[PDB]
Design a binder for this molecule. Structure first.
Ligand SMILES: [Cl-]
Ligand SMILES: [Cl-]
Ligand SMILES: [Cl-]
Ligand SMILES: [Cl-]
Lengths: 130, 145
């Protein structure tokens, strides 16, 4: 992993964030990380992988470019001193971010939402027969 | 009765935690697989599941056994307490209230999204005082009656 992969990362990133907002919709993330080249790439199917990555999400369900990079990077390297060193290094080189949930909590939120939705639909069906 | 999307998710989750590529996960790994799927069963619930169908005591589960276990657990519809607990994830204060606007967002942003027609009727039925607030413990009691 070297400049080639990171250079590739932001070239790919620009296609997904043309206005250079530094954020991408969570709904586009699976496509984004699938599109990268190896090793940073996480090939499809990757939805549960991305959940397990526990990425911070900000209002409007967006995820910052660096959180993704670091996660993809740590995925290949591991929790090492170099990884820690590289991250801090990269953040400085890269340099409002406020997390309201994470991809991991969000999957549980989806499950809870579905319980509610199904109960409401059942309620509507029961009402219409009585 | 499991949906195709669910099977793909289960396959990805299971394979993701099958450390050895052995086709089997460990019973201890089961809770983590389930959390990767958004399910948060308690240790007691997890033990009940782990205990059933790991008769041999080997400590592993293969994907057929997981599907069967998964299919059983999810098919039975949710109790009122479960539904109440589902609301609580969205209640920032744990006070039994969620704003109607927040409820509307969750309902249409996640999951088996409510249609415009459905969410509007939900809010009519839930915000009984027209004060922008939903006491969901009352609303779940109404909705499950
Ligand atoms: Cl945008
Ligand atoms: Cl996927
Ligand atoms: Cl073997
Ligand atoms: Cl009930």
């Amino acid at each position: 992993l070297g400049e080639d992969d990171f250079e590739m990362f932001y070239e790919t990133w620009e296609k997904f964030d043309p206005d250079a907002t530094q954020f991408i919709a969570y709904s586009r993330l699976s496509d984004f990380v699938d599109t990268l080249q190896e090793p940073l790439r996480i090939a499809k199917p990757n939805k549960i992988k991305l959940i397990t990555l526990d990425l911070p999400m900000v209002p409007g369900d967006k995820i910052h470019c660096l959180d993704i990079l670091f996660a993809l990077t740590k995925e290949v390297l591991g929790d090492s001193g170099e990884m820690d060193a590289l991250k801090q290094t990269m953040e400085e080189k890269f340099m409002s971010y406020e997390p309201i949930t994470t991809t991991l909590k969000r999957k549980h939120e989806e499950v809870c939402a579905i319980k509610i939705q199904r109960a409401y639909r059942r309620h509507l069906l029961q009402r219409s027969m009585k | 009765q499991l949906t195709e999307e669910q099977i793909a998710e289960f396959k990805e989750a299971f394979s993701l935690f099958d450390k050895d590529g052995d086709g089997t996960i460990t019973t201890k790994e089961l809770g983590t697989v389930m959390r990767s799927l958004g399910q948060n069963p308690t240790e007691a619930e997890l033990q009940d599941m782990i205990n059933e169908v790991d008769a041999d005591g080997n400590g592993t589960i293969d994907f057929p056994e997981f599907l069967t276990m998964m299919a059983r657990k999810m098919k039975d519809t949710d109790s009122e307490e479960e539904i109440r607990e589902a609301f609580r994830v969205f209640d920032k204060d744990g006070n039994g209230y969620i704003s109607a606007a927040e409820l509307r967002h969750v309902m249409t942003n996640l999951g088996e999204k409510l249609t415009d027609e459905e969410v509007d009727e939900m809010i009519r039925e839930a915000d009984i005082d027209g004060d922008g607030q939903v006491n969901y413990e009352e609303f779940v009691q109404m909705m499950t009656a």
